[PDB]
Structure formats: C-alpha cells, structure tokens
C-alpha cells in the first residue's frame, strides 16, 4: 500500500494545466481574467480553491454535467461562426466584467439587445456540415425588474428556444431580484447544445437571448479535471492524486480515492 506523497503534482508525463485563478467553466465562457486560457488543451486540468469569477453574475443549471464533458474533451478550441443577428444591437457589455479599462463581457458570448425601439423575433440557423460534434454554449438573461426588461428587450416577456433535429430547449426568463452580487441583482443562465454531423442548430428568440459566437470542437479521450491545492513540480509520475503524485509500483494505495492515470487501487 502506497501511503505517502511528495505533496507535489509531477508535470510529466501527463499534460497538466494549472488553472490558477480560474475555474474551467470561466475559461470556457471567456471571463476576461481567464482569457489567457483561450484555445488551451490538457490531459489534466487542475482547479484551485482560490479561483474566483469576475464577470457578469451567472449560474449553470446542471453545472456538473457541462464541467464534466468539457473536462473530458480536454480542449477549449473555439471556432467563430458568422451568425447574422438582424435588427438587434450586438456586443453588449458590463462594468461587472471590465476587459482592460472599459466594460466588456464573456468573450465567447454575445449579449443582444434592442435596436431602436424594437427587438424582432430572431430566427437563425447554422448547419453542421462537418464530421465532428459541435458544442454550442448560449444563455438567457434574467432581469431584476420590469423596467429593465423593457428597456433592454422591448417585449414584456422574452423567450429563447434552441433546437436540433431531435432535441429542443425553451427557456422563459424569470424577472425578479436575486441576492446582490458585485452590484447586480440580475443573472445570466448558461445552457448548451450539441449538434451532430448532418444536423442543424436553430435559435429563435424574441428577447433575453445571450447568443453564441461559434462552437467548441468536441473531442473524446483521456482528459479529466481535478480539485487540488498541490504545487506543480518538474518530475515524472504516472499517477496523480489531489494530494500529489504517488508511485504506482504497489498494487494498492491509501492517499486519495480521487486519482488520474495509471494508479494503484484505493483501499
């Protein structure tokens, strides 16, 4: 039984990506202090307890599932697509999410609002003519007041519907206050949609849509994610635990039930 660790994660042979101040989801959406992680790849993504968000306040229903599937994919490769958003204003931003000195927003999302005195029913399509799966991340704004709702979106109640040829999600925004976070009582909710080859994305909304800018390329493989505060050293070990790397010469181990790589069995 391997019962000890050096207390350090070895950076070989597996590709370790240290998240520092960022969670994987913040890296995905493009929180500004996380844009360093754009287009990055990993065998193991390491999330630190000191990570924090610093953009528009948001939640992700089924957070655990999105985080898991991106972590398993092992890449943030993003491909911009030319969505056309007729009759609305694009690139909305916020002082909750400064990028350099000015207001900004998640890099991978596009906050649409009214143009002039109207917000038409948006109805756009994007076919998948490739031979891989595309992951689309999109969102819904929930305003805190009715005044806010109409100022941004004109319609008294919005709706976002995103579908493929065999799946559909319709979200109705919910107006009201949540607890004040960084000055704001409103929220964005994040959703995702996978589109297989030969399929197509349709987005239909008459308000409150936080639009995608493109897609993340999905991969399959050996990638994963781990929560750990262990420093990352230059050394070689096949087996990684949140406690540090451990030797795998023994058949069993008692360091941590969470492991990655060729590891002894936890007892």
């Amino acid at each position: 039984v391997q019962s000890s660790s050096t207390g350090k994660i070895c950076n070989n042979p597996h590709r370790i990506l240290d998240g520092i101040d960022c969670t994987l989801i913040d890296a995905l959406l493009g929180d500004p202090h996380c844009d360093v992680f754009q287009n990055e790849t990993w065998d193991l993504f390491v999330e630190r307890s000191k990570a924090f968000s610093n953009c528009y306040p948001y939640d992700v229903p089924d957070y655990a599932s999105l985080r898991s599937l991106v972590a398993s994919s092992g890449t943030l490769e993003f491909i911009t697509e030319g969505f056309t958003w007729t009759g609305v204003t694009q690139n909305g931003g916020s002082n909750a999410c400064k990028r350099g000195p000015g207001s900004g927003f998640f890099s991978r999302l596009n906050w649409l609002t009214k143009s002039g005195s109207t917000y038409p029913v948006l109805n756009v399509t994007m076919p998948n003519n490739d031979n891989f799966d595309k992951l689309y991340i999109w969102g819904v704004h929930h305003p805190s007041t009715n005044q806010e709702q109409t100022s941004l979106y004109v319609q008294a109640s919005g709706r976002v519907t995103v579908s493929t040829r065999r799946s559909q999600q319709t979200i109705i925004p919910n107006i009201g206050s949540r607890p004040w976070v960084r000055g704001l009582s409103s929220r964005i909710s994040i959703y995702w949609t996978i589109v297989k080859p030969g399929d197509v994305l349709v987005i239909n909304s008459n308000g409150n849509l936080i639009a995608p800018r493109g897609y993340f390329k999905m991969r399959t493989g050996k990638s994963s994610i781990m929560r750990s505060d262990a420093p990352i050293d230059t050394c070689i070990s096949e087996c990684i635990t949140p406690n540090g790397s451990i030797p795998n010469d023994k058949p069993f181990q008692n360091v941590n039930k969470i492991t990655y790589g060729a590891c002894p069995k936890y007892v």
């Epitope: 204003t89 906050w111 704004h141 305003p143 806010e148 100022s151 704001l184």
Partner: antibody
Framework: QVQLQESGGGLVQPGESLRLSCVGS?????????????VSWVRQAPGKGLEWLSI????????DYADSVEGRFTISRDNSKETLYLQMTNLRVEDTGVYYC??????????????????????????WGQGTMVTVSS | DIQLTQSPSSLSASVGDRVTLTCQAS??????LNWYQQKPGKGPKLLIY???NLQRGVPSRFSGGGSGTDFTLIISSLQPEDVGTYYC?????????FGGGTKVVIKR
C-alpha cells in the same frame, strides 16, 4: 419624455470662468431618465447657426470636444442628480451666445442591468433645453 | 471636419406650395443625417432622423430623402406655422456638424 433645462448663464469678463448646468426631468421608454443617454452641448452665437461643442456618454466616458473649445471646456455629469455640467475657462468674446444641452436618442446604458452599449452612437437630438444666455464682455 | 452646405440660404413661398430644401455633405456620410426646425426665440426640434424617418408627432407634410452626400427635406404643402429656420446635421464622424441653415418665409 425627458425634459431638459439649462441654467448658469450670465455675464462674465474675458478670461474668467463659468459653470453651466442642465437638469433632466421626466422619462422616456422603460421609464428611462437622462442618465440612460449620451448628451451634447451645442451653442448658437447671436444671429448665427448651431455649433456642436462637446459630447459625453451616459456613463461619463467617450468624451470629445470641438477644436474651438478643446483644452478650455470640460464636460461632465452627475447621474445621481440627473445633471450635466459644462465648465468653461479662459472665456473669450466670441464664446458669447445661447448654450443648449441636447439628448441623443439611442439608449446607451441601463445601470440596473449592468448593461452598456459597446459603442457611442451619437444619433439625433430628440430633446433640447430652452437654452441659457452667456455674455462675455468687459 | 465634414462640412454641410444648405440651399437655398433663404426662401419665400406661398401657402400650399411644395418646398424643397437641400443639404450637401463634403464626404459620404451614408444616412447619418438629421433635420431640425427652429422657430425664433425657441430651441430646435427634430423633424427627420437618419435621412428619412419622420419623428413622432411631426406633421406628415414633412418628408426626408437622400443618401451619401445628397439629402433633401420636403414640405408638401407649406403652412404659415412653418416659418422658421431648418438645419441639417451630420453624425457620420466627429466633430458633429450642422448646415448653415435655411430660412423659410411666407408670402401672403
């Protein structure tokens, strides 16, 4: 609709300073008030046409000045009071005229939602004040 | 600076006449052009925004046209209350500029 009213005008000697104010009241779509909008100062010398002087965005940024007053005038705003200011210094005789404050029509920010338009539109002046008379004379 | 030149400088016409005012820009300003009316001793009022849009509450006898460098404000049937000065104004680029104004005068 939002309404504007300038004040602060008066007689001053050349070289002296003067601070104009402009107070917004009422409201437009979505109960928006002046602090949702970009605002400009525009002036009109006696018997002459209109001269744009300066613009400021809803949140206080993206300021610009006409060359004729750049380096002498400073535009600012206090959104808690829905008030705009134009601080004039080193005034000259040819600055004499009526000064109007004027709202641009496009919504530029909604504070309660932490939203801000990416760009300063600076489109049409849909509301003007009644103007305030400034005389620069010895 | 983009210069706007308005013609004519001054115009006299009878009640009921179709009247045409022109604004010429020194460079292509697309449709980023507005027209205002100012009555003596009063502040301007928006008539037309973005070259051709009639502002809410403005009488339908007013219409706007043009693009690029050439624009027109048309009054289909001049009324006595239409006397005053009309300005065009450009916001393609800073600094924002106004035409020198056209004064309208009634014949009776």
């Amino acid at each position: 609709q939002v309404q504007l009213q300038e004040s602060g005008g008066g007689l001053v000697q050349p070289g002296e300073s003067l601070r104009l104010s402009c107070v917004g009241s009422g409201s437009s779509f979505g109960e928006s008030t002046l602090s949702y909008y970009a605002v400009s100062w525009v002036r009109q010398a006696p018997g002459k046409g209109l001269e744009w002087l300066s613009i400021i965005n809803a949140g206080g940024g993206d300021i610009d000045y006409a060359d004729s007053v750049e380096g002498r005038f400073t535009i600012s705003r206090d959104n808690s009071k829905e008030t705009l200011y134009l601080q004039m210094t080193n005034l000259r005789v040819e600055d004499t005229g009526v000064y109007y404050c004027a709202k641009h029509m496009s919504m530029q920010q909604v504070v309660s939602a932490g939203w801000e338009r990416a760009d300063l539109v600076g489109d049409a002046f849909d509301v003007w004040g009644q103007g305030t008379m400034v005389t620069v004379s010895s | 600076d983009i210069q706007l030149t308005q013609s004519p400088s001054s115009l006299s016409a009878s009640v009921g006449d179709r009247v045409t005012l022109t604004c010429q820009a020194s460079q292509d300003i697309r449709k980023f052009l507005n027209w205002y009316q100012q009555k003596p001793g009063k502040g301007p009022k928006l008539l037309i925004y973005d070259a051709s849009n009639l502002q809410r509450g403005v009488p339908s006898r007013f219409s706007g046209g043009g693009s690029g460098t050439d624009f027109t404000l048309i009054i289909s049937s001049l009324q006595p209350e239409d006397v005053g000065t009309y300005y065009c104004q450009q916001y393609d680029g800073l600094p924002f500029t106004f035409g020198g104004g056209t004064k309208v005068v009634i014949k009776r």
